[PDB]
Amino acid sequence: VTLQDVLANDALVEFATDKNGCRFLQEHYPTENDNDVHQKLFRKLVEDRAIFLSLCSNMFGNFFVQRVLECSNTEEQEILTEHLATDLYNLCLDKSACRVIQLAIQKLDVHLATRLSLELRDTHLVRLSIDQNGNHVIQKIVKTLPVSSWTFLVDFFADDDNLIHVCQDKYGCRVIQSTVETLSTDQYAQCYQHRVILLRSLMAGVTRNCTQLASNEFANYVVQHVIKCGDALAVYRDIIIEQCLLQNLLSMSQEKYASHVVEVAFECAPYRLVAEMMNEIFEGRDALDILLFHQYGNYVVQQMIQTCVLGQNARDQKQSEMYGMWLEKIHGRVMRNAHRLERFSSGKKIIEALQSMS
RNA sequence: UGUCAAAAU
Secondary structure (H helix, E strand, C coil): CCHHHHHHCCCHHHHHCCHHHHHHHHHHCCCCCCCHHHHHHHHHHHCCHHHHHHHHCCCCHHHHHHHHHHCCCHHHHHHHHHHHHCCHHHHHHCCCHHHHHHHHHHHCCHHHHHHHHHHHHHCCHHHHHHCCCHHHHHHHHHHHCCHHHCHHHHHHHCCHHHHHHHHCCCCHHHHHHHHHHHHHHCCCCCCCCHHHHHHHHHHHHHHHHHHHHHCCCCHHHHHHHHHHHCCCCHHHHHHHHHHHHCCCHHHHCCCCCHHHHHHHHHHCCCHHHHHHHHHHHHCCCCHHHHHHCCCCHHHHHHHHHHHHHCCCCCCCHHHHHHHHHHHHHHHHHHHHCHHHHCCCHHHHHHHHHHHHCC
């Protein structure tokens, strides 16, 4: 069998819907754009829009379409962009066609992929951001294309309700993370700070709603990302710590999901905010006794122990002395209630750590 | 002793 056989029999669909036939088409498809067999196969692919869009939706057919994307020049890409734009929203939600869309985002010329990105502006973006398939399309656009192709997403997520729904979703939290990273990893090389204004418009909702976001089963991760980020998002980290966590550390160390946020905050914060957090913990049966004997706050106590142990090895010796004070206070309270703590592993681990350091 | 943590052959 050869390709002239499938061109003469008009059987492109019948091999591309088969596994072995599509692998034959992929292995023998000519890569040079001026080959006649290349052009005849391309015409048979794109001459009927319904056939093309059904081949994009196929379990085995899509791959051949993806190979046609890898070999394509600008004239072929214009036709492909028009056919994809006619059904882009359902193509993004499909298990097979979304991979064609993602490869198109990587491989098309930037104005063509910009056109496809801006086609989605008036669709249902929450539904697209929370789908198992379309989330990856949104992330591919954000991490691939320049920002002017997707600032409508920053405007969309500037609304508070939209942010909460996407951030609290299993998949949309990943979308929020990728957008914050892309807008923060850059702006450093920029001279006019265009991306950090967009990042401030995005992070205003996060700081405005971060108590509910930190208490959530999926949005907590997003709240941990900012705090764990570093100097790129350090201002927003410090805003979250001074506004949300302070005067609420006793409550959220006891919650199932927000205790991870409190733990990450003890792990990654400046000394002033750490000192204010230790002030809140040691100055409310008081708060440290509650957190030693709690199913979630015990891990917060362990994190305080670890950030005092690694904290003592510091250049400024005043901060190191305060770290020693805090660790000595924790050590004294644990040796006061060691008898009961030994009953549960919650305490065995805490003691083992306090034993490691004498 | 604590989290549902990302879609094809």
